[PDB]
Curated annotation (Swiss-Prot):
Species assigned in the record: Escherichia coli (strain K12)
Protein name as catalogued: UDP-N-acetylmuramoyl-L-alanyl-D-glutamate--2,6-diaminopimelate ligase
GO cellular component: cytosol
Activity regulation, per record: Activated by potassium phosphate.
EC number in record: 6.3.2.13
Residue positions where N6-carboxylysine is found in the record: 217
Positions of ATP binding: 113-119
């Protein structure tokens, strides 16, 4: 890493300096570092140029706005200070070059949209790895090689990606936030593929507003190296964009493929939702097939189909994808199914809000031939507002509501339960059982073979907070033990 080589594409004959790390934060800028001084929200890193120099940085790259001409090379206390216009816009490119273009040295897939981003990202990484990649994820959860995810600027994005390259990653599935995209955080990344789980947004009922929204986003995407575009056609905006993008892949499970266009497509033709997952029959421009998914709900059918279409577009053979599909697993604590011979199906899900609980129950229902049971509670010493709403939801969308404890903390456990019951039309029809373990057991042992039991609120959060004590407890382990299987 040399300053001169670093800047060669933009500033000829920049001074030669060995560079250590690249940072935006003057507080950590150390001997040999490249400090980058940017202007943001009510912030100007140029203020800290003296501090960075005093700390022994090798060089500084700074925003030119109001202070210098683009490419102007200055010298302060012997330290090169090079000014660049539109530095925020160029930061990704600058960092890309600093870190030896990590996105040129693995297959990067970007996933954007409001729903299904996390799951689709995980499925991409999982499936590619089953096909022989060493895969990684970058997301809100965290970054890392698959199964080693560690819990944000354009520089951090490039740094992290370079870290993954160093660890031997050949494939990375990256969640891209709307905000991140707008702030140029992935501007210089070479995406092999871009997955659009949806393109619609709330608050755009005015035609003028939808037009502006689409224009802003279209402009943004036009400035990125998106690679192959894989678009959910069950989204209204998705369909409109597909009509303008003849090389994009159209994906649907609700009959939104237009065969007249002769483009690439993938669609579910039928789904059988059963106890252990979904049997998904699909047709595609690559051929037809059947996948045995071990994921639950209609949304996860969509997420799987998006991942499949993406990997097909990237050239992974259909036969190999089909051969590995049955090994795709649920995201940790998310609609995780446990089945056992002659026992009810049990789903462990993290849902702990009204909206999430409703979605979870709707998903579980699709796999439920018999009665749907819902075992849940609400956290103590937190906002009480959700309590009656979650009560109402369990009553409406499940057949049997089993109300129990979920991290009561220092609050009277039965008071929390009463708050939940208060939201129900017929509280008397709910089952109340305290001791969460006991409640789970009640449901599992009483449910019929063709019933489904949703155990909501925790996912893989393996503790129960009672008073001030974080007690060892796991829904997954409790469920597995009851069913005679291994969590």
């Amino acid at each position: 890493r040399n300053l001169r080589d670093l800047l060669a594409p933009w500033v000829p004959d920049a001074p030669s300096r060995a560079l250590r790390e690249m940072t935006l934060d003057s507080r950590v800028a150390a001997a040999g570092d490249l400090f980058v001084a940017v202007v943001g929200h009510q912030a100007d890193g140029r203020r800290y140029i003296p501090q960075a120099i005093a700390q022994g940085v090798a060089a500084i790259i700074a925003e030119a706005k109001d202070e210098a001409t683009d490419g102007e090379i200055r010298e302060m206390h012997g330290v090169p200070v090079i000014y660049l216009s539109q530095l925020n816009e160029r930061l990704s490119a600058l960092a890309g070059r600093f870190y030896h273009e990590p996105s040129d040295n693995l297959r990067l897939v970007g996933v954007t949209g409001t729903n299904g981003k996390t799951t689709t990202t995980q499925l991409l990484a999982q499936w590619s790895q089953l096909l022989g990649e060493i895969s990684a994820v970058m997301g809100t959860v965290g970054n890392g090689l698959l199964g080693k995810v560690i819990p944000g600027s354009a520089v951090d994005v490039q740094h992290e990606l370079a870290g993954l390259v160093d660890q031997g990653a050949t494939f990375c599935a990256m969640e891209v936030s709307s905000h991140g995209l707008v702030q140029h955080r992935v501007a210089a990344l070479k995406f092999a593929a871009s997955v659009f789980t949806n393109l619609s947004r709330d608050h755009l009922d005015y035609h003028g507003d939808m037009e502006h929204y689409e224009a802003a986003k279209w402009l943004l995407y036009s400035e990125h190296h998106c690679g192959q575009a894989i678009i959910n056609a069950d989204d209204e905006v998705g369909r409109r964009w597909l009509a303008k993008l003849p090389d994009a892949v159209a994906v649907s499970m609700e009959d939104h493929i237009n065969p007249n266009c002769h483009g690439r497509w993938l669609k579910a033709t039928e789904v059988n939702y059963h106890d252990s997952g979904a049997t998904i029959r699909f047709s595609s421009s690559w051929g037809d097939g059947e996948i045995e998914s071990h994921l639950m709900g209609a949304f996860n059918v969509s997420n799987l189909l998006l991942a499949l279409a993406t990997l097909l577009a990237l050239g992974y053979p259909l036969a190999d994808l089909l051969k590995t599909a049955a090994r795709l697993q649920p995201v940790c604590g998310r609609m995780e199914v446990f089945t056992a011979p002659g026992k009810p199906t049990v789903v462990v899900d993290y849902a702990h809000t009204p909206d999430a609980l409703e979605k979870a129950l709707q998903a579980a229902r699709l796999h439920c031939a018999g009665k749907l049971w819902c075992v849940f509670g609400c956290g103590g010493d937190r906002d009480k507002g959700k309590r009656p709403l979650m009560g109402a939801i369990a009553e409406e969308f499940a057949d049997v509501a089993v109300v129990t404890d979920d991290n009561p903390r220092t609050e009277e456990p039965r008071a929390i339960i009463n708050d939940i019951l208060a939201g129900m039309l017929d509280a008397g029809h709910a089952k109340v059982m305290e001791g969460r373990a006991e409640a789970v057991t009640c449901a599992v042992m009483q449910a019929k073979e063709n019933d489904v039991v949703l155990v909501a609120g925790k996912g893989h959060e393996d503790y129960q907070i009672v008073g001030n004590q974080r007690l060892d407890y796991s829904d997954r382990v409790t469920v597995a033990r009851l069913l005679g299987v291994i969590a």
